[PDB]
């Protein structure tokens, strides 16, 4: 089973899809390394540039690891950032409804 983490991104400026996709693989790579990263199996799904919200996928066992990895983030391309996890769900269906409807998808 996988799990899906919905998150908000607070920053000095609005970020683009390409930047967050990249930034997800950097948090995990420094926090968990390539082995830990391979065990957690993180996977960027989508990012809504309007509302600065996104989704990322992980193995169910390694959720808190990846949540930690993103909180540990500080800076994306020379501009300070804060990741806030809005919630977790077993499906993008429930996730979008429960947590991302507000932004709104």
């Amino acid at each position: 089973k996988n799990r899906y983490i919905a998150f908000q991104v607070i920053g000095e400026r609005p970020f683009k899809k390409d930047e967050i996709k990249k930034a997800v693989w950097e948090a995990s790579l420094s926090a968990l390394g390539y082995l830990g990263s391979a065990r957690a199996k993180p996977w960027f799904i989508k990012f809504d540039e309007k509302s600065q919200t996104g989704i990322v996928r992980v193995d169910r066992k390694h959720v808190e690891e990846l949540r930690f990895a993103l909180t540990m983030l500080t800076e994306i391309n020379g501009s300070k950032v804060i990741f806030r996890t809005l919630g977790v769900s077993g499906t993008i269906k429930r996730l979008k409804r429960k947590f991302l409807a507000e932004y709104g998808w």
Binding site: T71, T74, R84
Partner: protein
């Protein structure tokens, strides 16, 4: 019901206040000698009216200053910055409200079975601050996390009170309740324990 126990910046306080039910503003106080207790109580009273609940953080190398401020018996939570094994030690002995990050700037946890015993007896909480991790480099990150792990093992064993906190000196250092629970969890806390570090234990203190 989540509680941010330590924020040190107006901007940070308001941001946390989006994501937290209770946010304790903290007055960082760098110390070598005693302070003017007139000016200090005045400054502390303003913050009570401004931010409601307030905490006083002592950063010093003179342990007597802890056992002096404490005596003045002020209308604010008494925090102490960890790091100096003297200050760590004195802080617990003095019955202070919380010791913040005993590992700060150290090459070891700065905390042992004994200090845990005293902390439990005296009711002194331990602050698991995120701010150092944010500011450290990968090596440092790993070192700090190791220290936090040992501390937690002890803190759990002796039923020592504790909380997790941002210790944010700017809004960029602020994180949400679940975001902070990750730290606890990955340090070894079970989910119910990590929730208590924001809910049950901070409630008890304020």
């Amino acid at each position: 019901y989540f509680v941010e126990m330590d924020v040190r910046d107006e901007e940070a306080h308001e941001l946390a206040s989006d994501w937290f039910d209770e946010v304790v503003f903290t007055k960082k106080l760098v110390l070598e000698d005693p302070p003017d207790w007139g000016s200090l109580k005045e400054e502390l009273k303003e913050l009570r009216g401004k931010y409601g609940k307030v905490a006083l953080l002592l950063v010093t190398r003179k342990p007597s200053l802890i056992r002096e401020v404490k005596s003045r018996n002020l209308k604010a939570l008494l925090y102490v910055q960890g790091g100096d094994m003297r200050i760590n030690r004195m802080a617990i002995e003095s019955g202070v409200d919380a010791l913040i990050s005993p590992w700060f700037g150290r090459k070891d946890p700065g905390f042992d079975h004994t200090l845990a015993g005293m902390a439990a007896r005296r009711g002194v909480a331990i602050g698991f601050s995120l701010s150092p991790l944010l500011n450290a480099n990968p090596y440092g990150r790993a070192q700090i996390l190791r220290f936090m792990m040992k501390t937690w093992q002890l803190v759990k064993k002796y039923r020592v009170p504790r909380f997790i906190t941002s210790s944010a000196e700017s809004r960029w250092e602020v994180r949400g309740p679940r975001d902070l629970m990750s730290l606890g969890i990955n340090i070894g806390m079970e989910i119910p324990e990590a929730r208590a570090s924001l809910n049950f234990y901070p409630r008890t203190i304020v």
